[PDB]
Amino acid sequence: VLSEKEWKLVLHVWAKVEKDKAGHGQDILIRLFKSHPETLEKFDRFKHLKTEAEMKASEDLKKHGVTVLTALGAILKKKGHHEAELKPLAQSHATKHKIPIKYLEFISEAIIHVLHSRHPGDFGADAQGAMNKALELFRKDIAAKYKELGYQG
């Protein structure tokens, strides 16, 4: 459970993300693919991009960045009350895309990295802890829904 204080720290940082959603989303996916290259194998649509500069130049990767942050932003704004938002995401990521929880840990690490890179003044230890707690709650709840669908990834 996040406190009101922790949610405010999360949603203040998120408001900065929403000022350049496409830039943040693209940088998060590129960070993911750079830090954990195996993750790129899950994306038939992007696995032809070979350099960081090619990924940065990809309008289609950037649009997927917007998808991912729009979905996560809607979940974070529910402050834990996100059953309805997780349902479709759990169904696709468990049974179609087959995304293990360790890859949701990797993308969580990429989110923390990009938000600290872009907002070092306003993303110190307490805001990082609160964002980590929010992403931990997301991963815990989606893992529970994964298992309800029979997926042990």
Q: Does 45 bind ligand HEM (CB under 6 A)?
A: yes
The CB-of-119 to ligand HEM minimum distance in angstroms stands at 18
Q: Which two tokens stand for residue 86?
A: 């997780």
| Among the listed residues 43, 79, 80, 153, the single contact to ligand HEM using CB under 6 A | 43
The CB-of-73 to ligand HEM minimum distance in angstroms stands at 9
Question: Is 81 within any annotated ligand binding site?
Answer: no
Angle value at C-alpha 36, between 2 and 58, nearest 5 degrees: 95
Q: Does 78 bind ligand HEM (CB under 6 A)?
A: no
Q: Does 95 bind ligand HEM (CB under 6 A)?
A: no
Number of residues that bind ligand HEM (CB under 6 A): 17
Q: Go through the chain and list every residue after which a break occurs, taking a C to next N gap over 2.5 angstroms, comma-separated.
A: none
Q: Residues forming the annotated binding site for nitrite?
A: 64
